[PDB]
Design a protein around this ligand. Structure first.
Ligand SMILES: *[C@@H]1O[C@H](CO)[C@@H](O[C@@H]2O[C@H](CO)[C@@H](O[C@@H]3O[C@H](CO)[C@@H](O)[C@H](O[C@H]4O[C@H](CO)[C@@H](O)[C@H](O)[C@@H]4O)[C@@H]3O)[C@H](O)[C@H]2NC(C)=O)[C@H](O)[C@H]1NC(C)=O
Ligand SMILES: *[C@@H]1O[C@H](CO)[C@@H](O[C@@H]2O[C@H](CO)[C@@H](O[C@@H]3O[C@H](CO[C@H]4O[C@H](CO)[C@@H](O)[C@H](O)[C@@H]4O)[C@@H](O)[C@H](O)[C@@H]3O)[C@H](O)[C@H]2NC(C)=O)[C@H](O)[C@H]1NC(C)=O
Ligand SMILES: *[C@@H]1O[C@H](CO)[C@@H](O[C@@H]2O[C@H](CO)[C@@H](O[C@@H]3O[C@H](CO[C@H]4O[C@H](CO)[C@@H](O)[C@H](O)[C@@H]4O)[C@@H](O)[C@H](O)[C@@H]3O)[C@H](O)[C@H]2NC(C)=O)[C@H](O)[C@H]1NC(C)=O
Ligand SMILES: *[C@@H]1O[C@H](CO)[C@@H](O[C@@H]2O[C@H](CO)[C@@H](O[C@@H]3O[C@H](CO)[C@@H](O)[C@H](O)[C@@H]3O)[C@H](O)[C@H]2NC(C)=O)[C@H](O)[C@H]1NC(C)=O
Ligand SMILES: *[C@@H]1O[C@H](CO)[C@@H](O[C@@H]2O[C@H](CO)[C@@H](O[C@@H]3O[C@H](CO)[C@@H](O)[C@H](O)[C@@H]3O)[C@H](O)[C@H]2NC(C)=O)[C@H](O)[C@H]1NC(C)=O
Ligand SMILES: *[C@@H]1O[C@H](CO)[C@@H](O[C@@H]2O[C@H](CO)[C@@H](O[C@@H]3O[C@H](CO)[C@@H](O)[C@H](O)[C@@H]3O)[C@H](O)[C@H]2NC(C)=O)[C@H](O)[C@H]1NC(C)=O
Ligand SMILES: *[C@@H]1O[C@H](CO)[C@@H](O[C@@H]2O[C@H](CO)[C@@H](O)[C@H](O)[C@H]2NC(C)=O)[C@H](O)[C@H]1NC(C)=O
Ligand SMILES: *[C@@H]1O[C@H](CO)[C@@H](O[C@@H]2O[C@H](CO)[C@@H](O)[C@H](O)[C@H]2NC(C)=O)[C@H](O)[C@H]1NC(C)=O
Ligand SMILES: *[C@@H]1O[C@H](CO)[C@@H](O[C@@H]2O[C@H](CO)[C@@H](O)[C@H](O)[C@H]2NC(C)=O)[C@H](O)[C@H]1NC(C)=O
Ligand SMILES: *[C@@H]1O[C@H](CO)[C@@H](O[C@@H]2O[C@H](CO)[C@@H](O)[C@H](O)[C@H]2NC(C)=O)[C@H](O)[C@H]1NC(C)=O
Ligand SMILES: *[C@@H]1O[C@H](CO)[C@@H](O[C@@H]2O[C@H](CO)[C@@H](O)[C@H](O)[C@H]2NC(C)=O)[C@H](O)[C@H]1NC(C)=O
Ligand code: NAG
Ligand code: NAG
Ligand code: NAG
Ligand code: NAG
Ligand code: NAG
Ligand code: NAG
Ligand code: NAG
Ligand code: NAG
Ligand code: NAG
Ligand code: NAG
Ligand code: NAG
Ligand code: NAG
Ligand code: NAG
Lengths: 120, 451, 121, 43, 120
């Protein structure tokens, strides 16, 4: 069975630091690409970051974030930094159909529960 | 009235199951010695016209979306490509700082920063001496570090082996046959939408010519449908599932690389050779592809008409260009003559349909190295091919991904997509399933075993 | 007239040709070897299951253990003329691995009754 | 402020090593236990 | 089946340039050695060039020629250069018995059709 977990997140001061994680347990780790989606209240899902064979980021990341996948633990991290208050939203974790990343939400078939992140 | 039980060995009955298949390759090419991928030197030779015998009064249900042969086939290709790269040579010595600059031999205005002329020191056959060789690398295979100081893009993630010149990447058909005790069914209904009972099912010891083709979208050289362009899906209501459109009449596509590349040999060490692009002869022209304007518009007409049976008749169906993301999903990466292409497709999926001669030209890009779909880590190096590479192919199907719009706003937008690399074969293994025979059944009759 | 060439026909008529479905049952390189070992192994299992019963290779092994009307509750001539084997298997698919035990008991019990019968002479 | 229990147990070693690029080199350091280093001939 | 196919050759001006080739199809290339023989009119066959593990040349080659075998295509090339009129003859291609080259014609068991070369 394919299932995913997530890190804590939690409240973070404006301009602070935070790290997320997502462990892929069921399927093989070196045969799929993982990516993170955010869903602000009253808005649809959109791409944030994703690591296949080459990193990708959204238009609003502007290099603030950093994404890397540890092959040993079979997890993908997200070294977010300097979180503006507009970034508050629920950050999901999803696995792509294959080793490529597509910005549309319909390119993934195994989502996560969702991690709550807020900035004040 | 008293009747007894009996057991009938060798009775025809089967149950769904899975197992491991094996070689079936044509013996015509055996004489042509080629220890390439998808090997024939190590196989059971195929059989001419296998025992394809029809069945009557039989009803069987197929389900390709949960088929095991496609999953089994995938692990086969993964385990094969790795085996074919072991005897090749690594590229660890080549990860060196490069001094590069633009190349301008009256280059065309279409591309300016596409070819970089790089020179780097390198160890010769004798380690005491060193040589200053030069080569031309595409702009997608070099990054700046700090001016002119570039390195190969893959020299900080994972080194990878050169593609052996001996092996070839062209598609060799691979028939699949079940082992003793098993049998492979084969549906034959023309109006077969992937799932559901198939009335005229027939058995065969071996599948027809199956050529696995490495493509993301617009899968090439597929098996044409008989009639009535089909739309095979899993949960068409859900938009997260792909839609493998397969049409009967194929549209021919011509792809060429007008650049007159010349190969140059450089010695990695004792007995280890590395090939690099030499000097481009003649003018430089962007690699492109062509598809007939008239046929393509008609082909989309069939797909749109056949797609309305699921979304009503008063629906504004309009196509849109690719999604946007990894370079291997935005374009379609198809192998052609040993070189990997990346062809922009925004010129095809651009139109809108209401329910009331010329040739399309599109650009393409080429990458010498590729992060192979087999695994995330290892890359690959594609040696240059001399002369001009041109290859024609049959575009037989499409891989469309629907857009998750609102229930209102009946304009439903489809986008080309893919990259799964399992759906490519699923379009060719949608007819077959593997079954296990279970002899020695039990039936009632009348006997008395004499003592 | 071929391998599984009468699967959809009448079960009584399916018995006309039973050797074709049995003769063609025993006939990356590691994959081939594993399949061959599995293929031969399966045939040995089936033959052994017939061996413990009152037959070896007769190909029509009619046993004397009583039949149950509850298992099928179908008329003898009603099922041997129209219904096919595949449909028949599903009807009594649930009632499997129980008749097999009965056959073994009806044979081992009978075997000794024959052995001591030949000994009283 | 190492404890008095052990003095010559952890050694702070630094050595040149080849980076991802074959041409360049880097000076990295690490700590090795006393049972993994021997003297040759000072440090 | 073992068979060989030669190259064009053809007429070449004296002191010109030419290239010959011979592809081995049937047997394994990396377990046999090829060689070239010429038969001038009214004369017996004689050695010209051959490549096993170390190149060899005839007495009259004098270093003008150059022989090399490409393991990839399973073919042997022969770089003619400075063709004098006396070099006109039919140049055969032959496969040695095993991994070695002998100057006697009887050390080969699979000959080619014969390439015609003329110099004027
Ligand atoms: C879909 O099917 C079509 C139909 O076959 C296929 O087109 C084929 O492309 C290959 C590309 O290599 C063609 O093969 C080449 O043809 C040229 C023509 O001049 C030859 O010169 C080539 O020979 C050289 O390269 C070989 C590569 O191994 C060497 O072994 C050889 O010694 C030469 O150096 C080579 O044979 C092939 O002819 C066409 N098929 C045709 C024209 O019918 C297309 O590629 C398929 N689609 C995909 C995505 O592969
Ligand atoms: C050995 O030394 C380590 C380095 O000092 C010790 O790690 C410390 O562990 C504690 C508790 O586990 C941390 O205290 C927490 O700090 C976070 C803030 O850290 C955030 O940033 C880091 C940066 O990577 C990130 O990893 C975290 O997840 C957080 O996002 C607070 O939010 C918590 O409330 C809590 O106070 C220390 O921060 C951490 N040290 C450092 C330098 O980060 C380790 O505990 C030592 N081992 C033992 C056995 O004591
Ligand atoms: C890309 O550039 C290449 C280099 O210019 C082009 O190769 C040219 O190909 C043509 C026809 O195939 C040749 O014209 C012939 O020349 C021979 C004489 O050449 C002899 O010497 C060469 C040296 O190796 C040898 O390979 C030949 O086999 C011959 O032995 C004439 O005899 C013919 O009649 C004919 O004129 C050119 O000579 C050749 N160029 C060079 C520099 O040798 C190639 O065609 C270009 N690609 C495209 C698509 O145009
Ligand atoms: C292997 O090398 C590549 C190429 O440098 C690394 O990716 C690159 O990493 C750098 C920083 O490590 C990124 O620089 C950043 O670029 C953004 C703009 O995208 C800029 O706003 C930032 O200020 C920063 O300069 C760079 O973007 C990124 N990508 C490319 C194409 O250069 C990669 O991280 C290396 N591998 C490992 C494991 O570190
Ligand atoms: C890539 O750049 C390197 C150096 O920046 C180029 O190396 C040299 O390029 C010249 C012409 O661009 C080649 O021809 C030379 O021309 C001079 C002109 O007087 C002549 O005196 C020389 O005898 C020679 O013919 C030269 O061969 C070449 N060097 C080597 C070692 O080949 C290189 O040409 C550039 N790449 C391309 C594709 O232009
Ligand atoms: C690996 O090294 C050997 C040794 O040098 C190469 O064979 C030698 O190649 C040279 C020229 O490449 C030959 O020199 C020629 O010698 C003749 C006399 O036989 C002379 O008339 C010519 O003017 C020229 O100087 C040499 O004969 C030849 N053999 C030996 C024993 O040195 C071999 O080609 C090298 N391998 C590769 C793949 O290049
Ligand atoms: C593929 O065809 C099968 C039957 O040929 C379809 O099966 C039924 O489809 C209807 C709707 O078209 C459903 O209401 C039924 O529940 C389905 N029954 C079964 C047993 O599947 C199937 O829906 C078709 N699928 C697609 C994607 O067109
Ligand atoms: C693809 O089509 C384009 C036209 O859009 C072709 O480009 C022309 O090709 C002819 C061929 O002789 C040249 O004379 C022209 O100069 C080219 N450009 C234009 C603007 O017409 C191209 O050759 C075609 N390629 C293939 C492989 O079919
Ligand atoms: C792709 O190339 C093929 C062959 O090079 C073209 O097919 C030929 O088209 C011409 C058009 O005048 C016909 O006269 C020939 O009979 C065709 N031959 C074959 C074998 O098909 C094809 O037209 C090219 N594609 C496009 C879009 O132009
Ligand atoms: C593929 O080609 C199309 C055009 O054929 C490109 O579309 C361009 O999109 C940008 C984005 O705003 C526009 O500024 C350009 O004007 C468009 N092109 C033209 C000719 O108008 C598309 O960008 C190409 N694909 C990629 C990945 O660049
Ligand atoms: C995609 O389709 C649109 C039409 O829906 C094309 O829009 C036309 O583009 C041409 C070429 O630039 C212009 O001359 C027309 O004026 C455009 N139409 C309108 C109404 O303004 C668009 O060009 C197509 N994309 C590409 C790359 O050709
Ligand atoms: C199929 O059944 C029909 C009637 O049930 C019968 O006439 C026909 O012969 C059967 N098929 C075959 C191949 O015998
Ligand atoms: C070289 O090409 C780049 C684009 O790839 C361009 O920005 C630059 O001006 C060109 N000239 C030089 C000297 O780099
Ligand atoms: C090769 O080594 C020499 C040694 O000084 C150096 O000057 C030159 O820049 C090196 N080549 C490159 C491409 O860096
Ligand atoms: C298709 O997806 C929709 C989405 O909610 C779901 O309601 C429906 O049950 C799914 N159908 C199938 C056959 O999976
Ligand atoms: C243009 O560049 C090509 C590349 O070799 C060359 O052959 C040709 O002579 C050049 N023409 C002009 C006018 O510079
Ligand atoms: C495609 O064909 C339809 C009808 O066949 C026509 O209405 C439409 O204009 C055509 N589109 C193009 C781009 O030729
Ligand atoms: C849609 O069109 C098809 C054929 O054009 C027709 O059979 C069907 O009844 C139509 N349905 C509606 C709702 O108009
Ligand atoms: C698709 O078209 C849009 C139109 O703005 C463009 O921005 C995007 O880059 C195109 N996608 C590709 C892959 O070219
Ligand atoms: C494309 O399809 C046509 C029609 O079936 C066929 O004749 C042709 O050989 C196909 N092209 C290939 C196999 O390259
Ligand atoms: C027949 O089946 C019933 C219930 O399935 C069972 O109680 C009975 O013992 C069986 N009798 C025989 C002879 O198998
Ligand atoms: C088999 O019978 C048991 C009880 O009689 C029942 O629970 C089960 O669902 C049956 N299964 C099938 C496949 O008929
Ligand atoms: C370091 O530790 C050693 C014991 O391992 C001791 O003999 C020596 O005096 C210490 N100080 C220096 C400078 O080596
Ligand atoms: C590393 O190389 C430099 C080059 O001069 C040298 O001075 C230094 O001592 C080396 N590092 C070590 C630990 O010896």
């Amino acid at each position: 069975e394919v299932q995913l977990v997530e890190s804590g997140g939690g409240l973070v001061q404006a301009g602070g630091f935070l790290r997320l994680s997502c462990e892929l347990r069921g399927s093989i780790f070196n045969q799929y690409a993982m990516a993170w989606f955010r869903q602000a209240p009253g808005k649809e899902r959109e791409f944030v970051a994703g690591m296949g064979a080459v990193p990708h980021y959204g238009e609003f990341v502007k290099g603030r974030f950093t994404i890397s996948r540890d092959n040993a633990k079979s997890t993908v991290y997200l070294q977010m930094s300097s979180l503006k208050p507009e970034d508050t939203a629920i950050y999901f974790c999803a696995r792509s159909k294959s080793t490529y990343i597509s910005y549309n939400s319909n390119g993934y078939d195994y989502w996560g529960r969702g991690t709550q992140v807020t900035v004040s | 009235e008293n009747l007894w039980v009996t057991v009938y060995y060798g009775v025809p009955v089967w149950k769904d199951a899975e197992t491991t298949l094996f070689c079936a390759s044509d013996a015509k090419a055996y004489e042509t010695e080629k220890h390439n991928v998808w090997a024939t030197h190590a196989c059971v030779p195929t059989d001419p016209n296998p025992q394809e015998i029809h069945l009557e009064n039989v009803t069987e249900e197929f389900n390709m979306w949960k088929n095991n042969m496609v999953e089994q086939m995938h692990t086969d290709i993964i385990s094969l490509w790795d085996q074919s790269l072991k005897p090749c040579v690594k590229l660890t010595p080549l990860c060196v700082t490069l001094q590069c600059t633009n190349v301008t031999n009256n280059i065309t205005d279409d591309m300016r920063g596409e070819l970089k002329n790089c020179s780097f020191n390198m160890t010769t056959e004798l380690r005491d001496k060193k040589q200053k060789v030069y080569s031309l690398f595409y702009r997608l295979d070099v990054v700046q570090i700090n001016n002119k100081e570039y390195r190969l893009i893959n020299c900080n993630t994972s080194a990878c082996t050169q593609a052996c010149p001996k092996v070839s990447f062209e598609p060799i058909p691979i028939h699949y046959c079940a082992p003793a005790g098993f049998a492979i069914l084969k549906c034959k209904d023309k109006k077969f939408n992937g799932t559901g009972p198939c009335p005229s099912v027939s058995t065969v010891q071996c599948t027809h010519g199956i050529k696995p083709v490495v493509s993301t979208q617009l899968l090439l050289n597929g098996s044409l449908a008989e009639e009535e362009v089909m739309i095979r899906s899993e949960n068409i209501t859900n938009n997260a599932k792909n839609i493998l459109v397969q049409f009967n009449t194929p549209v021919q596509i011509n792809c060429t690389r007008p650049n007159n590349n010349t190969r140059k040999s450089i010695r990695i060490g004792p007995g280890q050779a590395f090939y690099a692009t030499g000097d481009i002869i003649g003018d430089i022209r962007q690699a492109h592809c062509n598809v007939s304007k008239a046929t393509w518009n008609e082909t989309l007409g069939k797909v749109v008409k056949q797609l309305r049976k699921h979304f009503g008749n008063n629906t504004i169906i309009r196509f849109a260009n690719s999604s946007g993301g990894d370079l291997e999903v935005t374009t379609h990466s198809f192998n052609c003559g040993g070189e990997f292409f990346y062809c922009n497709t925004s010129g095809l999926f651009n139109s809108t349909w209401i329910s009331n001669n010329d040739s399309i030209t599109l650009p393409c890009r080429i990458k010498q190295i590729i992060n192979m779909w087999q695994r995330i880590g290892q890359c690959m190096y594609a040696p240059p091919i001399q002369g001009v590479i041109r290859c024609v192919s049959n575009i037989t199907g499409l891989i469309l991904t629907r857009d998750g719009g609102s229930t209102n706003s009946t304009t439903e937008t489809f986008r080309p997509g893919g990259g799964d690399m399992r759906d490519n074969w699923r379009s060719e293994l949608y007819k077959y399933k593997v079954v296990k025979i279970e002899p020695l059944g039990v039936a009632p009759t009348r006997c008395k075993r004499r003592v | 007239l071929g391998f599984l060439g009468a699967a959809g026909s009448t079960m009584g008529a399916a018995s006309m040709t039973l050797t074709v479905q049995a003769r063609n049952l025993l006939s990356w390189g590691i994959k081939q070897l594993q399949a061959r070992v599995l293929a031969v192994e399966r045939y040995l299992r089936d033959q052994q299951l017939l061996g413990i019963w009152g037959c070896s290779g007769k190909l029509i092994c009619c046993t004397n253990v009583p039949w149950n009307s509850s298992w099928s509750n179908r008329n003898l001539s009603e099922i041997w003329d129209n219904m096919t084997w595949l449909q028949w298997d599903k009807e009594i698919s649930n009632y499997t691995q129980i008749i097999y035990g009965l056959l073994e008991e009806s044979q081992n019990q009978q075997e000794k009754n024959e052995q001591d019968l030949l000994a009283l002479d």
